[PDB]
Write a protein that binds this ligand. Structure first.
Ligand SMILES: Cc1cc2nc3c(=O)[nH]c(=O)nc-3n(C[C@H](O)[C@H](O)[C@H](O)COP(=O)(O)OP(=O)(O)OC[C@H]3O[C@@H](n4cnc5c(N)ncnc54)[C@H](O)[C@@H]3O)c2cc1C
Ligand SMILES: Cc1cc2nc3c(=O)[nH]c(=O)nc-3n(C[C@H](O)[C@H](O)[C@H](O)COP(=O)(O)OP(=O)(O)OC[C@H]3O[C@@H](n4cnc5c(N)ncnc54)[C@H](O)[C@@H]3O)c2cc1C
Ligand SMILES: CC1=Nc2ccc(Cl)cc2[C@H](c2ccc(C)cc2)N1CCCN(C)C
Ligand SMILES: CC1=Nc2ccc(Cl)cc2[C@H](c2ccc(C)cc2)N1CCCN(C)C
Ligand SMILES: [Br-]
Ligand SMILES: [Br-]
Ligand SMILES: [Cl-]
Ligand SMILES: [Cl-]
Lengths: 487, 491
């Protein structure tokens, strides 16, 4: 049939837009995805990347990995139990995660089936013409058409996909996709990449690895988590090392060979070599545009392969929109959901709305985790004459007792020292992702450092640290780091 | 001949949250000469509080350490949903190790504060009992008995009363067989059966502590003379906390109040309630309230007025009716929180010795209850708001988070409620129940001070997946109050 809206990708942005157009605006909506539930072959499915092979299962898996620390840290508080009897049962973790995600998948299929004007189609969506979306049996554009759907408006929301550098032996590497489904936890694992997916998985593998296992994270440059606070980048490196992960910086895989026993022989540019059981590539994610046959309608793509869009998510083709990771901007679920919601409000509501991509709070579920919102100081120092940095870094007391003395909580506030405006807030330590959330609200309210400092703390918490800092630890004046102001 | 009393700009009586903040600030920021008096240099019996105050010694610090210990009961159990396997029959909660570790941690804090006296010019510690001999004289005596030997007589230009509060022990037959939180911190063994009397945070929190470390066959019961524990808190939370305590094995006796306590021949306590009901327990912990500790200060020597409920009466700037005599923290019987005593102390010193007169804002103070799971709260509860504003909106989110479907603790509903003035969207109160509530709430305190509106919460992009993001995905009230009266839709 014909629809007010055809959504290609039943994911975070897609389902927001679909649901809202159907239920808030009474529109006739079609949503297409390649799989109704999670896992191989296509990994992402109804619900999106986040639901199936993204935020949801990884958070459960990190939650899982945290018990490594919990069991050990209990002793400090008088918990006694046979430490030798402890086993991290990965099969059980994945089965529980699988079931949890399947319930979300099922619960998305229910909502299609219960909601009028919102119909879901199985298969591969592509652009046949301006107002025509074809549904094929496979990603092969030569595969059998299942449906041809006329659409007043077409939304592209196909997310992203692991980027696999074209080094020899790349086919012996897995991405995050396959990591969610490993039948056994790897004894030795290389995670390639210094970004959050590699860091998060290195923490998960570290907790579930068999006896004598080793997790190694490698990263091509000097310091992992580029784009994050630098004190936090250094400190999380120390804390991952402290919990037995090897971080190989300035290293990059040049070749992966398959050993006959199924293990991988990794050769680095340096000529260094490492043998692991699993090489997980987590060096980036790229917009998922190949399969859309955008050539058919001339929808422009940026150098990076992302669908170009303006602030209202319009592509160059009128009635054709793109939101979410396909647009290659901020790759976060709540950003994609917001874009989706705003798009529907502009196309079917009376008031345009554009997503604000600044001051977005985000988290790394590393162990220990990171919460951050707004500018890191080096970016701050480039756009503001006077930047002040308030920093606190204390091993919390519970951790002196737990035995995890390396677990410093880091709290940094970055300000425009000229007016006191908070430019960004950066945290490392348990609760960092929870803490940062309302920080994000504060920045929308042009919070100044005196607003944080004059708020009464909640005690005892790590969070109160943010309401306890009134003197900068150091400044940037004209891009220049210095402990004191000049004059 | 005669010789000179040690003289100070400021004498602080009570080396606690409030006193130390004031003491330190007057000395290190305004170069004042500051005496601080407390009755013990380190934690524990006989006087329990000590250098560092209630918080350090027998309050926030040791209780948080103990709640953290208590949380492992839940972690060890919940770990199994995530594939952790171990021999659950080898599991034992060793209370003595908990308390020994907690004692070491508190002792390092005590030592650390003593070093800080030792190292800081113009900031002097005096061990003993502080009382007001006259308007500008603080005497320090050997014991709380106003007839014990005067150890030191201090000349003081300004006197800060910062003696905190103390547990209220109801005048019942056999009160002497009961304890307070003070003693809970030093019990040589974990009680097998305990009654925590009180519906407020300290009873709720210690109920969870006792519950986690109690020996085999133990039972923790909490009683409260009223209908619903945690008066002052959001009602959905109060009822959820009650359910989640029960789910965790704590017996909640509401509408019950002890009338007397007798010692059984085996040394256990036989509690009879007003209603005739009875309970035997090993420990009865009274946590029905804390009262301002005004009794030993001999305030009648200088005529410092008490409120009819017994705090030192102060104005917004912490002044008593007596010039140069001030009072901050629990002695004023306002909000009994550490960061508030601290805020009062700094604001007092700024006003008296700095050039920055300032008063504490006692509204929109975030606070926490370390139940398991905890409560994080800031600002007005809806029933209070409804009395002050014509249109109140309530936005509420509730649900067992996913991790807890997998962990198995499905009773563990996260509750998030935002209370607004519906006439301009201004957030009046935010109320959280669930893991990390205390951490979440802190920046929410900053939001309230910036007069955030629900539209600012809603406009903010969620951090995913967190519990906190619930606060930024609520756009439509669950219900309203329209002049006092609840309804799901406006008229
Ligand atoms: C391992 C990992 C961890 C992550 N963690 C977080 C996190 O903690 N927090 C956070 O905010 N973000 C996280 N992300 C990012 C988040 O998953 C994405 O930002 C988000 O899912 C993007 O939503 P989307 O709507 O752009 O696309 P998606 O949610 O990816 O949806 C794309 C959908 O389109 C479907 N599709 C693709 N091609 C076609 C086709 N041609 N026809 C029909 N259907 C098609 C796919 O099957 C998929 O279901 C994580 C990502 C990964 C990979
Ligand atoms: C079990 C428990 C748990 C608590 N948990 C928290 C929590 O999690 N968060 C929070 O914010 N608050 C908590 N509180 C409250 C917090 O401890 C108090 O609000 C705060 O300590 C009050 O500060 P203060 O300066 O008024 O007094 P205090 O810190 O109590 O200090 C008063 C000091 O005066 C000394 N003193 C008393 N009389 C004399 C005398 N005549 N001469 C010399 N010295 C004297 C005492 O020995 C004491 O050290 C808790 C309290 C209790 C009892
Ligand atoms: C508003 C909304 N937004 C979404 C954004 C991203 C994802 Cl991955 C999912 C949603 C869900 C949702 C649920 C079912 C359908 C068919 C579409 C969207 N959804 C519906 C919310 C369910 N509600 C009853 C509590
Ligand atoms: C500013 C301040 N406020 C307090 C409020 C309540 C308490 Cl319990 C403690 C403090 C501490 C403190 C510690 C020791 C002394 C002698 C004074 C103040 N304190 C000083 C902290 C020292 N700082 C340099 C790490
Ligand atoms: Br009571
Ligand atoms: Br009541
Ligand atoms: Cl396994
Ligand atoms: Cl890399």
């Amino acid at each position: 049939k014909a629809f007010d809206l055809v959504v290609i990708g039943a994911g975070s942005g897609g389902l927001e837009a679909g649901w809202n157009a159907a239920t808030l605006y009474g529109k006739r909506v079609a949503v297409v995805d390649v799989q109704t539930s999670h896992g191989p072959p296509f990994y992402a499915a109804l619900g999106g990347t986040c639901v199936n092979v993204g935020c949801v299962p990884k958070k459960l898996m990190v939650t899982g990995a945290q018990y490594m620390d919990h069991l050990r840290e209990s002793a400090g508080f008088g918990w006694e139990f046979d430490g030798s009897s402890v086993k991290a049962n990965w099969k059980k973790l994945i089965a529980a995660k699988n079931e949890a995600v399947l319930d979300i998948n099922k619960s998305y299929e229910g909502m299609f089936n219960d909601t009028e004007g919102l119909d879901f189609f199985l298969g591969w969506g592509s652009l046949e013409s301006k107002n025509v979306v074809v549904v094929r049996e496979t990603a092969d554009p030569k595969s059998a058409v299942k449906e041809r759907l006329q659409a007043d408006h077409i939304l592209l929301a196909t997310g992203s996909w692991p980027q696999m550098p074209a080094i020899p032996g790349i086919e012996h590497c897995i991405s995050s996709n396959e990591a969610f489904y490993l039948p056994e936890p790897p004894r030795r694992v290389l995670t390639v990449g210094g970004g959050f997916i590699s860091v998060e998985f290195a923490g998960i593998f570290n907790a579930y690895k068999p006896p004598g296992g080793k997790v190694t994270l490698c990263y091509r440059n000097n310091l992992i988590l580029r784009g994050f606070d630098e004190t936090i980048r250094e400190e999380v490196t120390k804390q991952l090392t402290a919990n037995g992960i090897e971080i190989m910086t300035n290293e990059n895989p040049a070749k992966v060979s398959l050993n006959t026993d199924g293990s991988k022989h990794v050769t680095f540019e340096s000529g260094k070599t490492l043998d692991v059981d699993v090489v997980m590539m987590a060096i980036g994610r790229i917009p998922r545009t190949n399969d859309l046959q955008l050539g058919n309608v001339g929808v422009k793509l940026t150098p990076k392969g992302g669908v170009q869009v303006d602030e209202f998510s319009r592509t160059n083709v009128p009635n054709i929109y793109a939101i979410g990771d396909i647009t290659d901007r901020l790759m976060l679920t709540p950003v994609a959901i917001n874009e989706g919601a705003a798009l529907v409000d502009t196309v079917f509501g009376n008031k345009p709305r554009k997503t604000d991509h600044t001051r977005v709070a985000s988290a790394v579920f590393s162990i220990p985790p990171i919460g951050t919102c707004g500018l890191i100081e080096e970016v701050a120092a480039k756009e503001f004459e006077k930047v002040a940095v308030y920093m606190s870094s204390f091993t919390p007391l519970m951790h002196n007792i737990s035995g995890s003395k390396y677990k410093k909580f880091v709290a940094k506030i970055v300000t425009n020292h000229s007016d006191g405006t908070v430019l960004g807030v950066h945290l490392l330590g348990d609760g960092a992702p929870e803490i940062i959330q309302a920080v994000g609200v504060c920045l929308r309210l042009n919070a100044k450092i005196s607003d944080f400092y004059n708020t009464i703390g909640v005690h005892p918490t790590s969070a109160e640290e943010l309401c306890s800092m009134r003197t900068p630890s150091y400044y940037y004046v004209k891009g220049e780091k210095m402990e004191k102001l000049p004059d």
